[PDB]
Design a protein around this ligand. Structure first.
Ligand code: HV4
Ligand code: HV4
Lengths: 259, 254
C-alpha cells in the first residue's frame, strides 16, 4: 500500500468532517426509515389531517414550499462548512470558491436528499417527520411536480447502496469541478479533484469489492444530477411568475442567478 | 519516561512543519534579511494588489478587514490538520473535537500571528508582503483599532523568544483545553493535555536552560490571549453594525 495510504487518510479526513458538518447522516436516516428502533420512528404525513396533526411536533402548498427553502438554506450552510474542510479548497481563488459552491450546492443537496428518501416518501424535520411521495404529488400542480424528479433519481441512486464514507468523497468531487462556468484558475481545481477522484476510486474498491465498476456508475450519476438541477431552475422560473407574492431566499437567489 | 516526552515533542514539531507553511523561523528570516513587498500607505497598497497575489484583492479599510478573516479561515484549516496529528485527538468524541477547535482557533491564530509580527508591522501573503503597523492604525474607525491589540500582545509574547519546536507543543496545549464550554468528556482531554504540558515543560527546560521559569510565563500568556480573543469578538459585532451573499457564508466565523 504505497501512495494508497495517503488516499486512505484523505478518505478518513473527509468522512470525519462529513459527520461533523451534516447532522442527519444516511446511517441515521436508514435506521429511521427501516425500523431499527421504537424511539426513532417518524410521524408520517400523507394527507391534510396528518399534516395538521403533525404540525405540533415540527396556504398549505406555500407553507411546505417555504419549509423546503429554509431546509435548503441550512443545507447550503452545511455544504459550505464541509467545503471549507476539503484540503486545498480555501487555498483557491476566492471567486473560484464562490463559483464552485454556486454550481455544486444543489447537485449535492439532491444527492444527500436521496439519503432521506425511499420510493414512498422523504424524511423531514431532522427525521421527526416523513412526508409521503403521493402527498407531495397531490399538492396543487405547480408545486406537485417539484419532488418527483428527486424521487426518481433517489430510487435509481440509492440502488448503488453507498454509505456516508462514500458520499463524503463523492460530494467533495462534485464541489471541485473544473468545468464550472466562470472559473478563473481551473488547473488547481482539477488537481484537487484528481486527488479526490483517486481517493473515491480506492474507497469504492475497498468498501464495495463486489460492485464491478461502481466508480464508473457513480460518476455517471452526475449526469442525472445535472438534469435534475436544470428542471428545478425551470420550475422555479414558473413559480416566480404564477406567485408574485412569494419570496425567494437571497442566498438561493444568488445561487440560481444567471445559472 | 522523558524519552516519551521527547518523542512527542519531535512528532508535534514534524507535524507543525507539515501543517504551517510560514514558520516562525521563515518569517523571522524575512523580518531580518534573506525581500517582502512593503505596504506602508494607500498608494503602496494599490501597487501591492497590482504586482503580488493576495486574498484581500476583491472602501479600502473594509477590504483590509475582510482579508484578515479570509486568512483566518485558511488558518483554521491548517490548525485543523495539525490538531488531527496530536496523539489521542482523533480518538476523542467528535463533538468534543469540534468544540475544542471552535474555541481554540482564535487563541492559536493570534499566537501564531505573533510569529509574523514585529513592533512595526505584520507579514502577509505567505511572507510575500509586509503591511506596516502605522498603515493599519491610519485606517478609519473602527478598523484602525482592530490590529493594535494584536501587536501589543505580539511584542510581549515575542519577548519570550520561543521557536517553532516550542510553539508546536504550546499550540497543542491550547487545543486540549478541558474548560471549553459544552465538552462531553473532559477526562481524556485533560489527560492528553497533562501529557502535552509535561512535554512542553521538558522542551522549554532543554531548549532554554538560561530562562528559569519560562514555562510559567508562557502559561501566564494565556490570560492575555483570552483577553485578546474576548475583546476581538466585541469589535466583530460592532463590525456587523457597519457593513451592510454566497461569499458571506464562507466567512461565517473568524
Ligand atoms: C413541494 C415541495 C418540497 O417538498 C419538501 C420536501 C422536503 C422538505 C423538508 C423539510 S420540511 C421541514 S420542517 N424540515 C425538512 O427538512 C420540505 C418540503
Ligand atoms: C485591519 C485589519 C486587517 O489587517 C490584516 C492583518 C493580517 C492579514 C493577513 C494576511 S492578508 C494576506 S493576502 N495574507 C495574510 O496573511 C490581513 C489583514
Amino acid at each position: 500500500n504505497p501512495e494508497s495510504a495517503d488516499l486512505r487518510a484523505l478518505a478518513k479526513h473527509l468522512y470525519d468532517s462529513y459527520i461533523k458538518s451534516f447532522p442527519l447522516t444516511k446511517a441515521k436516516a436508514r435506521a429511521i426509515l427501516t425500523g431499527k428502533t421504537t424511539d426513532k420512528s417518524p410521524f408520517v404525513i400523507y394527507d391534510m389531517n396528518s399534516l395538521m396533526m403533525g404540525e405540533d411536533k415540527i396556504e398549505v402548498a406555500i407553507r411546505i414550499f417555504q419549509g423546503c427553502q429554509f431546509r435548503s438554506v441550512e443545507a447550503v450552510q452545511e455544504i459550505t462548512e464541509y467545503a471549507k474542510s476539503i484540503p486545498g479548497f480555501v487555498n483557491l481563488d476566492l471567486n473560484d470558491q464562490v463559483t464552485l459552491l454556486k454550481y455544486g450546492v444543489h447537485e449535492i443537496i439532491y444527492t444527500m436528499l436521496a439519503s432521506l428518501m425511499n420510493k414512498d416518501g422523504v424524511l423531514i424535520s431532522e427525521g421527526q417527520g416523513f412526508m409521503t411521495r403521493e402527498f407531495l404529488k397531490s399538492l396543487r400542480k405547480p408545486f406537485g411536480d417539484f419532488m418527483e424528479p428527486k424521487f426518481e433519481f433517489a430510487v435509481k441512486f440509492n440502488a448503488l447502496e453507498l454509505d456516508d464514507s462514500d458520499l463524503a468523497i463523492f460530494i467533495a468531487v462534485i464541489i471541485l469541478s473544473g468545468d464550472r462556468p466562470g472559473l478563473l484558475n481551473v488547473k488547481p481545481i482539477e488537481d484537487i479533484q484528481d486527488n479526490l477522484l483517486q481517493a473515491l476510486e480506492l474507497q469504492l474498491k475497498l468498501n464495495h469489492p463486489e460492485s464491478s465498476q461502481l466508480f464508473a456508475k457513480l460518476l455517471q450519476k452526475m449526469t442525472d444530477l445535472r438534469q435534475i438541477v436544470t428542471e428545478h431552475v425551470q420550475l422555479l422560473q414558473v413559480i416566480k411568475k404564477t406567485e408574485t407574492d412569494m419570496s425567494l431566499h437571497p442566498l438561493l437567489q444568488e445561487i440560481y442567478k444567471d445559472l
